[PDB]
């Protein structure tokens, strides 16, 4: 079965995980994916290696990794695709079995729907 | 006069500013705000103090500051509101007495974000 892993930055504060948890609930309710997991790059659990390994353990053969970041940065272009084994080079460590494929997706970017949210927020809504 | 100031994290890489620039053009095209400026918390320029000051200079007495961040973090709960003069503390933003700053809320777990995430999952 396919899995979605949502991946976030992580924070010293708990808002970043809380955001990822809520988003995962919302996408679970769209019934697109049997398995939906979250990972945080830094600070808190679950880690990205932990989330990938938890989706393999549920028997996922195709894992979609969506970086929930607004723009590309060091995490989206280096730290994350390294962990997932997609580009080369005491860490975490993630082994990916041969029959598992990781599909690393694109961040949010300057999407029109973000300008919608910006306008709502401008009016305190 | 109503300025909207979009405020972002900033990074050592240039993509974060590029995102703020692009979003500011896109909100300009909605024609809701006469003045639209961007500021970056860290690393990049313009700074948040620089952006707010450059809105005052164009004569806005109402400046809306919208945090373009997914979740709250230390910048949105401490650094940005300190800078704007809305909380106590203990390169310098003045803020004249005839201008009001309205600090808004970050993006959060909006339904539109889950729509974007689903698009991104299928590679659109």
UniProtKB/Swiss-Prot annotation, chain A:
Substrate binds at residues 45, 70-75. Ni(2+) binds at residues 9, 75. Its EC number is 4.99.1.3, 4.99.1.11. The keyword Metal-binding applies. GO terms for molecular function: cobalt ion binding; nickel cation binding; sirohydrochlorin cobaltochelatase activity. Keywords: Cobalamin biosynthesis, Cobalt, Lyase, Metal-binding, Methanogenesis, Nickel. Co(2+) binds at residues 9, 75. It catalyses: Co-sirohydrochlorin + 2 H(+) = sirohydrochlorin + Co(2+); Ni-sirohydrochlorin + 2 H(+) = sirohydrochlorin + Ni(2+). Pathway: Cofactor biosynthesis; adenosylcobalamin biosynthesis; cob(II)yrinate a,c-diamide from sirohydrochlorin (anaerobic route): step 1/10. Belongs to the CbiX family. CbiXS subfamily. Catalyzes the insertion of Co(2+) into sirohydrochlorin as part of the anaerobic pathway to cobalamin biosynthesis. Involved in the biosynthesis of the unique nickel-containing tetrapyrrole coenzyme F430, the prosthetic group of methyl-coenzyme M reductase (MCR), which plays a key role in methanogenesis and anaerobic methane oxidation. Catalyzes the insertion of Ni(2+) into sirohydrochlorin to yield Ni-sirohydrochlorin. Homotetramer; dimer of dimers. This is Sirohydrochlorin cobaltochelatase. It comes from Methanocaldococcus jannaschii (strain ATCC 43067 / DSM 2661 / JAL-1 / JCM 10045 / NBRC 100440). The gene is cbiX.
